[PDB]
């Protein structure tokens, strides 16, 4: 879709080293905008993008109340989950939750999300209908019963269709100069001999936003997907992202190879070759 908002909650037990830590972060697309950490000297919701700073005292107080209350709720939930799996009080465990809304280019709700994991494994998820649950196992069935009694799915549907979208659209307007500006990649191809008969061609994309990008190598106009090494897209630290794709080619055959780049910020997709 065109735009999304997500909150990501992590709660981590640590027997013998205090009560479980709770962290929350909020993103619009690939831009983080708020954080909360229960381990902080003074735990409070803090801004992480300039466009959120304009929100009033009440916004920040409300966020901080919510996250302080979640810190306590999540400690109880970790105790409960330990019991659901007959686990000892000695091990460290993690609950993760992600939720939010996706908008299409017209700004309408494409779909809503609410997903949880326990120790990195899917545990319970709200189905795409925003009405029913998918529980991974007999432990998650207990959570499901609780959430049905508490009308959690109804509460989420109302948020995801309503406040989530409203606030997302507000943030997109307030941060429009960054959130709605796609920065195209700066691109180039480098060449590195590996032997007398082969060299690495590496196609670079730098300084792009958002992170979504396609980098492919073709030989004779044909995608070389199995032979291409593609590093994970990585943050530059200034909001932008970096990526490269590499192929090892026979020396003298370099011109049979083309790197193809697609990104939202480009007028048109690029076709690049090594230029000695």
């Amino acid at each position: 879709g065109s735009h999304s908002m997500r909150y990501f909650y992590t709660a981590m037990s640590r027997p013998g080293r205090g009560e479980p830590r709770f962290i929350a972060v909020g993103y619009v697309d690939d831009t983080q905008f708020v954080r909360f950490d229960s381990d902080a000297a003074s735990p409070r919701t803090e801004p992480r993008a300039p466009w959120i700073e304009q929100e009033g005292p009440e916004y920040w107080d409300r966020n901080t109340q919510i996250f302080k209350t979640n810190t306590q709720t999540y400690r109880e939930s970790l105790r409960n989950l330990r019991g659901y799996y007959n686990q000892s009080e000695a091990g460290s465990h993690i609950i993760q939750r992600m939720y939010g809304c996706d908008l299409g280019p017209d700004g309408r709700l494409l779909r809503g999300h609410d997903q949880s994991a326990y120790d990195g494994k899917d545990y319970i998820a709200l189905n795409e209908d925003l009405s029913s649950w998918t529980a991974a196992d007999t432990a998650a069935q207990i959570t499901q019963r609780k959430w049905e009694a508490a009308r959690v799915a109804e509460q989420l549907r109302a948020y995801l269709e309503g406040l989530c979208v409203e606030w997302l659209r507000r943030y997109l307007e307030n941060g429009k100069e960054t959130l709605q500006r796609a920065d195209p990649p700066k691109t180039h191809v480098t060449h590195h001999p590996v032997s007398d008969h082969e060299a690495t061609l590496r196609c670079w994309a730098l300084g792009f936003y958002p992170a979504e990008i396609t980098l492919t190598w073709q030989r004779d106009g044909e995608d070389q997907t199995q032979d291409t090494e593609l590093v994970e897209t990585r943050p530059a630290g200034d909001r932008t992202f970096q990526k490269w794709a590499a192929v090892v080619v026979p020396s003298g055959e370099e011109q049979r190879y083309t790197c193809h780049v697609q990104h939202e910020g480009l007028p048109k997709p690029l076709t690049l070759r090594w230029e000695p």
Partner: peptide, 9 residues
């Protein structure tokens, strides 16, 4: 803005 605190697990 986050949703209000929901029921525990």
């Amino acid at each position: 803005k986050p949703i209000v605190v929901l029921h525990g697990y």
